[PDB]
Amino acid sequence: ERQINTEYAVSLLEQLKLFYEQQLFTDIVLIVEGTEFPCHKMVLATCSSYFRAMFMSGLSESKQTHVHLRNVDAATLQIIITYAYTGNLAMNDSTVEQLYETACFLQVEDVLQRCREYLIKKINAENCVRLLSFADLFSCEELKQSAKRMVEHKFTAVYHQDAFMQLSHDLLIDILSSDNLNVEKEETVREAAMLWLEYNTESRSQYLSSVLSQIRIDALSEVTQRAWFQGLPPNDKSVVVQGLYKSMPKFFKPRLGMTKEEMMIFIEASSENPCSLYSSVCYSPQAEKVYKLCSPPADLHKVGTVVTPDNDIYIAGGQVPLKNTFRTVNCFYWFDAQQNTWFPKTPMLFVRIKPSLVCCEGYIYAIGGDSVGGELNRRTVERYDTEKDEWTMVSPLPCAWQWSAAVVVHDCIYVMTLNLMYCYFPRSDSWVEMAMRQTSRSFASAAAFGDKIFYIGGLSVTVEIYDVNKNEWKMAANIPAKRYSDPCVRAVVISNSLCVFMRETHLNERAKYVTYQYDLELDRWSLRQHISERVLWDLGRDFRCTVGKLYPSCLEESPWKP
Amino acid sequence: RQINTEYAVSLLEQLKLFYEQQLFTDIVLIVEGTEFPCHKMVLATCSSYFRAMFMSGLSESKQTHVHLRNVDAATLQIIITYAYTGNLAMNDSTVEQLYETACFLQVEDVLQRCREYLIKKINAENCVRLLSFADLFSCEELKQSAKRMVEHKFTAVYHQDAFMQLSHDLLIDILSSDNLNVEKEETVREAAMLWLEYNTESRSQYLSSVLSQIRIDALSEVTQRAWFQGLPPNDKSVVVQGLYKSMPKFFKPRLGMTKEEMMIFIEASSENPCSLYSSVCYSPQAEKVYKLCSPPADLHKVGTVVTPDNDIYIAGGQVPLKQTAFRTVNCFYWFDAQQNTWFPKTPMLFVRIKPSLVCCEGYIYAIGGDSVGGELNRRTVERYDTEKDEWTMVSPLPCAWQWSAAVVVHDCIYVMTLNLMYCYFPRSDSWVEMAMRQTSRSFASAAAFGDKIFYIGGLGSSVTVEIYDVNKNEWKMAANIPAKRYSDPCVRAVVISNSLCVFMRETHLNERAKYVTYQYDLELDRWSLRQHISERVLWDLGRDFRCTVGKLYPSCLEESPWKP
């Protein structure tokens, strides 16, 4: 006997739901603050494990037609009952907390796992500490850990969340004592503990002692003593004694967030093992090393990169071989700065090929990139919401462009094509016409350095500088490159200084990597650093470059023979 | 949206778990001392009786030990396990009590399932039993399928033991119908006579009604004194009744006596260019061309067979896959001689292209025809069971042949190829080497007339004829068919009117195709002009068309409207 479903799995379930709704065969009724729920017993067993032990134990409640169940919400119990009768939960985004609470109370494992997944997928920006305290209240390892890391990453950039103040000690100890604080400085966590304590002083006096010992000598060499002399309760002597002990021991160690080296993330590199096609690696300007990264899909290629001002990496679009015995997928991913993995996000609505993602005003803007090709209005765009986690359609492009580039300058969208340029106003959602270039060049990219756009390359060494306040295109100079070669130019910001990363290739000659330092008033690319081939190998042709901060300890060095 | 499959099956298995492992099982069914702990919700979701029993207000709304009587243990068990998992184990024996308990408990799903199974299971040796069963329980669709299949099979066997134990209304509906298949009107007469003489005074009152449905051509002749012999003694209310009642009931001829020997064609050239091919038929007696229903889903590249019981079947073939596009399917079908439609049957195991369907000893033999496997046994020859409705493999052909034909002579299968021949012994399931032909010819057909095989034509084709004798085991020449020179005759060997005739369509240079059949004199070795097919009735058919010998009804079929 297996489980074949000859149009019967749904028939029986439909009949069960009909019976629940008709007040039929009601052998048990739930009283929830005056509201009656005349359901049956067999089904409540399958769902609630509390009702499983309720409709079987030899206690008098099993022989009680009317049971008065309290500490449960009416709407949550109703949705749980209808899920038990139809399998459809249709959960919203607001009532997830009370639903999970009632599921943990009733011990309904399936809806518990469903809500756990829905919560672990929806830790976006704000409910992080709230759902972290929630998972601390209701033991939930999966939620606890994802939420822990999420806070270690974003909490160390706001450290002012209203919900962060109301936290239990053990959770705060686990948060602060961990070595995953994404902070480039050691005083921010100090003042964050300090603010918390100035808020609930006296009440959590032992807790404040522990949080001072948790900050350790690392951040104990500050005004912590004077602030305490200011707010301590009178007639306290041993407290000063125990505070004087907390300033030198507790294994003084450094932290991890300080290792935010501005590095050079690359994608689609020349793979070492012939079994793989491309790879994503990184380069260190100061450390002069070449680190690697894990492929987000591990088989799909032709992706686009973007870096938010908060140093976040995203990947959208791309094409993957069909593996029949290259199909385009609109999937989306995000790079973890510590786990060295890729957590997917809400996919796009159109399968794009090499999308150009631009970040502005906290929103991700994907401009062009072979949306579907057969659009009525072929020139359209689509943006992303980093807070609401959804895609919003905006005003479509004014001219259809291929192999285009797009940057962001002064909180405005700027997309560049062969010769035209349009500025998209995020406040009014419209395109305004901008200056036209006198040269028609494609297959090139642009960089947003300061208040000037530097469109480099095209087919070459065309250096066409554009300014927003002036609205004009001008030439500066030609990059010094060896003749009889085809340079692959890459313009990007580094250390608040405009530089370039170019590679020259000749006939019967090897490729050479070298970055130059360009000056604004000099119009010359001074030799900054020549990338030695002993550490970096060939990259290819379809590789991309972008600036971002990474961690050396989480990532791994790329092994390659000099 | 739909229903979450994950929970749907999780709930189903959890419900089944609560059933087998006695847990929340509340109501228990007491049947012949066997315990059946189960729930009320599952029983209500399927059985209408159980739904009515619990939701009511009677003592059963608060009872636990219901003594369900007039049921079976295994049937209730399989019904409960189906209600708990959706799995119905339908064998070939317990479907009767299954339908009984389903009609008792009023469970629509299992009722429809077993009704479909019995609509598939309807055959000869259970036609009358299934009809009596569909008369006992109201199963009008099953009742009609029974009646029809019944009708025909009843008027082909009329030896069923269950036929004696039948209700009067059912017998009246069977006999008085205009769908009986009998070459004469006297067999139904003696069938009614024996059904009446099965008893005596229990059939006397029905005697006055059964004679009211049979024509008066036999209600004035014999089998009136035979009833007077079996008449109750001194009964003077039946003798004179039948004496002065043999006057109305205007004698009208039935439909079963309209089976004429016809030339059934398939894959003929479609008249309207919207369709690829069609199926027509020639009337050697009516001299017209009646249309036939299209092959099932325009099934092309198939084979035909006409059993000695005059039944048409279709096996193999290919359907255009959803410009050249064709996929081969192993579907099997059966032609309804009255409803003018192709009823589906049990498909084969392997797909075939142009299979040679041959009937022998009640089995349908499809010998070769482009086997899919193409492995070391590139034949996959299969036999079909007309009793069990299933296929069974037989001894494979020793040699792989292509574009071959097969006939049946002396209860044996004779498959013919370019030059070789092998005879299959069904009793021993073996192949024996036969005589060798001296001419290499293919793409021809053979007709089995008596105890001789007549391989006509071969390669277009020609007028070469090689006659083979089974008792002599030798291939000899007889003559060549006199045809017009510089032409390509399309020969078709067939048996009709107890004589070997040929359907040979010839085409001249810059001329249209001409249809004419000849009668081959067996003792004189000469093809005589039996009849010339005028082109005013029969149009072009094509090249890949087949022909077979069979009987059809002109009444149920309609004339094909087409210009000469």
JSON list of N, CA and C in Angstrom, two decimals, chain A residues 332-361:
[
{"chain": "A", "resi": 332, "resn": "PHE", "atom": "N", "xyz": [18.34, 36.03, -8.68]},
{"chain": "A", "resi": 332, "resn": "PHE", "atom": "CA", "xyz": [19.06, 37.07, -7.97]},
{"chain": "A", "resi": 332, "resn": "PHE", "atom": "C", "xyz": [19.80, 36.45, -6.79]},
{"chain": "A", "resi": 333, "resn": "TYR", "atom": "N", "xyz": [20.95, 37.04, -6.45]},
{"chain": "A", "resi": 333, "resn": "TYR", "atom": "CA", "xyz": [21.78, 36.52, -5.37]},
{"chain": "A", "resi": 333, "resn": "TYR", "atom": "C", "xyz": [22.44, 37.68, -4.63]},
{"chain": "A", "resi": 334, "resn": "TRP", "atom": "N", "xyz": [23.03, 37.35, -3.48]},
{"chain": "A", "resi": 334, "resn": "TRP", "atom": "CA", "xyz": [23.74, 38.30, -2.65]},
{"chain": "A", "resi": 334, "resn": "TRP", "atom": "C", "xyz": [24.92, 37.60, -1.99]},
{"chain": "A", "resi": 335, "resn": "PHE", "atom": "N", "xyz": [26.07, 38.27, -1.97]},
{"chain": "A", "resi": 335, "resn": "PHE", "atom": "CA", "xyz": [27.30, 37.68, -1.44]},
{"chain": "A", "resi": 335, "resn": "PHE", "atom": "C", "xyz": [27.41, 37.93, 0.05]},
{"chain": "A", "resi": 336, "resn": "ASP", "atom": "N", "xyz": [27.71, 36.88, 0.80]},
{"chain": "A", "resi": 336, "resn": "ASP", "atom": "CA", "xyz": [27.92, 37.00, 2.24]},
{"chain": "A", "resi": 336, "resn": "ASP", "atom": "C", "xyz": [29.37, 37.39, 2.51]},
{"chain": "A", "resi": 337, "resn": "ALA", "atom": "N", "xyz": [29.55, 38.45, 3.31]},
{"chain": "A", "resi": 337, "resn": "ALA", "atom": "CA", "xyz": [30.88, 38.96, 3.59]},
{"chain": "A", "resi": 337, "resn": "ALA", "atom": "C", "xyz": [31.65, 38.12, 4.59]},
{"chain": "A", "resi": 338, "resn": "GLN", "atom": "N", "xyz": [31.03, 37.13, 5.21]},
{"chain": "A", "resi": 338, "resn": "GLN", "atom": "CA", "xyz": [31.71, 36.31, 6.20]},
{"chain": "A", "resi": 338, "resn": "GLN", "atom": "C", "xyz": [31.61, 34.82, 5.91]},
{"chain": "A", "resi": 339, "resn": "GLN", "atom": "N", "xyz": [30.47, 34.35, 5.41]},
{"chain": "A", "resi": 339, "resn": "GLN", "atom": "CA", "xyz": [30.28, 32.93, 5.16]},
{"chain": "A", "resi": 339, "resn": "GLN", "atom": "C", "xyz": [30.82, 32.48, 3.81]},
{"chain": "A", "resi": 340, "resn": "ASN", "atom": "N", "xyz": [31.23, 33.42, 2.95]},
{"chain": "A", "resi": 340, "resn": "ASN", "atom": "CA", "xyz": [31.77, 33.11, 1.63]},
{"chain": "A", "resi": 340, "resn": "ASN", "atom": "C", "xyz": [30.80, 32.24, 0.82]},
{"chain": "A", "resi": 341, "resn": "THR", "atom": "N", "xyz": [29.53, 32.65, 0.82]},
{"chain": "A", "resi": 341, "resn": "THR", "atom": "CA", "xyz": [28.49, 31.95, 0.08]},
{"chain": "A", "resi": 341, "resn": "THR", "atom": "C", "xyz": [27.59, 32.99, -0.58]},
{"chain": "A", "resi": 342, "resn": "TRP", "atom": "N", "xyz": [26.49, 32.52, -1.16]},
{"chain": "A", "resi": 342, "resn": "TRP", "atom": "CA", "xyz": [25.55, 33.37, -1.88]},
{"chain": "A", "resi": 342, "resn": "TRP", "atom": "C", "xyz": [24.13, 32.98, -1.50]},
{"chain": "A", "resi": 343, "resn": "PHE", "atom": "N", "xyz": [23.44, 33.88, -0.81]},
{"chain": "A", "resi": 343, "resn": "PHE", "atom": "CA", "xyz": [22.04, 33.66, -0.45]},
{"chain": "A", "resi": 343, "resn": "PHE", "atom": "C", "xyz": [21.15, 34.30, -1.51]},
{"chain": "A", "resi": 344, "resn": "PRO", "atom": "N", "xyz": [20.25, 33.55, -2.13]},
{"chain": "A", "resi": 344, "resn": "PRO", "atom": "CA", "xyz": [19.38, 34.13, -3.16]},
{"chain": "A", "resi": 344, "resn": "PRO", "atom": "C", "xyz": [18.37, 35.09, -2.55]},
{"chain": "A", "resi": 345, "resn": "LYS", "atom": "N", "xyz": [17.77, 35.89, -3.43]},
{"chain": "A", "resi": 345, "resn": "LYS", "atom": "CA", "xyz": [16.76, 36.87, -3.04]},
{"chain": "A", "resi": 345, "resn": "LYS", "atom": "C", "xyz": [15.61, 36.78, -4.03]},
{"chain": "A", "resi": 346, "resn": "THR", "atom": "N", "xyz": [14.72, 37.76, -3.98]},
{"chain": "A", "resi": 346, "resn": "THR", "atom": "CA", "xyz": [13.57, 37.80, -4.87]},
{"chain": "A", "resi": 346, "resn": "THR", "atom": "C", "xyz": [14.03, 37.93, -6.32]},
{"chain": "A", "resi": 347, "resn": "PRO", "atom": "N", "xyz": [13.73, 36.96, -7.18]},
{"chain": "A", "resi": 347, "resn": "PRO", "atom": "CA", "xyz": [14.19, 37.04, -8.57]},
{"chain": "A", "resi": 347, "resn": "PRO", "atom": "C", "xyz": [13.49, 38.16, -9.33]},
{"chain": "A", "resi": 348, "resn": "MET", "atom": "N", "xyz": [14.01, 38.44, -10.52]},
{"chain": "A", "resi": 348, "resn": "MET", "atom": "CA", "xyz": [13.44, 39.47, -11.38]},
{"chain": "A", "resi": 348, "resn": "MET", "atom": "C", "xyz": [12.18, 38.96, -12.06]},
{"chain": "A", "resi": 349, "resn": "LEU", "atom": "N", "xyz": [11.56, 39.83, -12.86]},
{"chain": "A", "resi": 349, "resn": "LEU", "atom": "CA", "xyz": [10.40, 39.46, -13.65]},
{"chain": "A", "resi": 349, "resn": "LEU", "atom": "C", "xyz": [10.73, 39.17, -15.10]},
{"chain": "A", "resi": 350, "resn": "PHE", "atom": "N", "xyz": [11.90, 39.60, -15.57]},
{"chain": "A", "resi": 350, "resn": "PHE", "atom": "CA", "xyz": [12.34, 39.37, -16.94]},
{"chain": "A", "resi": 350, "resn": "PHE", "atom": "C", "xyz": [13.73, 38.76, -16.94]},
{"chain": "A", "resi": 351, "resn": "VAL", "atom": "N", "xyz": [13.93, 37.77, -17.80]},
{"chain": "A", "resi": 351, "resn": "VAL", "atom": "CA", "xyz": [15.21, 37.08, -17.89]},
{"chain": "A", "resi": 351, "resn": "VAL", "atom": "C", "xyz": [16.17, 37.95, -18.69]},
{"chain": "A", "resi": 352, "resn": "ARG", "atom": "N", "xyz": [17.10, 38.61, -17.99]},
{"chain": "A", "resi": 352, "resn": "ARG", "atom": "CA", "xyz": [18.02, 39.55, -18.61]},
{"chain": "A", "resi": 352, "resn": "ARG", "atom": "C", "xyz": [19.37, 38.91, -18.89]},
{"chain": "A", "resi": 353, "resn": "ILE", "atom": "N", "xyz": [20.04, 39.42, -19.92]},
{"chain": "A", "resi": 353, "resn": "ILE", "atom": "CA", "xyz": [21.38, 38.99, -20.30]},
{"chain": "A", "resi": 353, "resn": "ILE", "atom": "C", "xyz": [22.32, 40.15, -20.00]},
{"chain": "A", "resi": 354, "resn": "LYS", "atom": "N", "xyz": [23.25, 39.94, -19.06]},
{"chain": "A", "resi": 354, "resn": "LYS", "atom": "CA", "xyz": [24.20, 40.95, -18.62]},
{"chain": "A", "resi": 354, "resn": "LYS", "atom": "C", "xyz": [23.50, 42.23, -18.20]},
{"chain": "A", "resi": 355, "resn": "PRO", "atom": "N", "xyz": [22.76, 42.23, -17.10]},
{"chain": "A", "resi": 355, "resn": "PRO", "atom": "CA", "xyz": [22.07, 43.44, -16.66]},
{"chain": "A", "resi": 355, "resn": "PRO", "atom": "C", "xyz": [23.02, 44.41, -15.98]},
{"chain": "A", "resi": 356, "resn": "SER", "atom": "N", "xyz": [22.74, 45.70, -16.16]},
{"chain": "A", "resi": 356, "resn": "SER", "atom": "CA", "xyz": [23.52, 46.78, -15.56]},
{"chain": "A", "resi": 356, "resn": "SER", "atom": "C", "xyz": [22.77, 47.29, -14.34]},
{"chain": "A", "resi": 357, "resn": "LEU", "atom": "N", "xyz": [23.23, 46.88, -13.16]},
{"chain": "A", "resi": 357, "resn": "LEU", "atom": "CA", "xyz": [22.59, 47.26, -11.90]},
{"chain": "A", "resi": 357, "resn": "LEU", "atom": "C", "xyz": [23.26, 48.51, -11.35]},
{"chain": "A", "resi": 358, "resn": "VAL", "atom": "N", "xyz": [22.44, 49.48, -10.94]},
{"chain": "A", "resi": 358, "resn": "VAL", "atom": "CA", "xyz": [22.92, 50.75, -10.40]},
{"chain": "A", "resi": 358, "resn": "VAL", "atom": "C", "xyz": [22.22, 51.02, -9.08]},
{"chain": "A", "resi": 359, "resn": "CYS", "atom": "N", "xyz": [22.98, 51.41, -8.07]},
{"chain": "A", "resi": 359, "resn": "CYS", "atom": "CA", "xyz": [22.45, 51.72, -6.75]},
{"chain": "A", "resi": 359, "resn": "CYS", "atom": "C", "xyz": [22.32, 53.22, -6.59]},
{"chain": "A", "resi": 360, "resn": "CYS", "atom": "N", "xyz": [21.17, 53.67, -6.09]},
{"chain": "A", "resi": 360, "resn": "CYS", "atom": "CA", "xyz": [20.92, 55.09, -5.86]},
{"chain": "A", "resi": 360, "resn": "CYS", "atom": "C", "xyz": [19.77, 55.24, -4.88]},
{"chain": "A", "resi": 361, "resn": "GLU", "atom": "N", "xyz": [19.97, 56.10, -3.87]},
{"chain": "A", "resi": 361, "resn": "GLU", "atom": "CA", "xyz": [18.96, 56.38, -2.86]},
{"chain": "A", "resi": 361, "resn": "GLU", "atom": "C", "xyz": [18.48, 55.11, -2.16]}
]
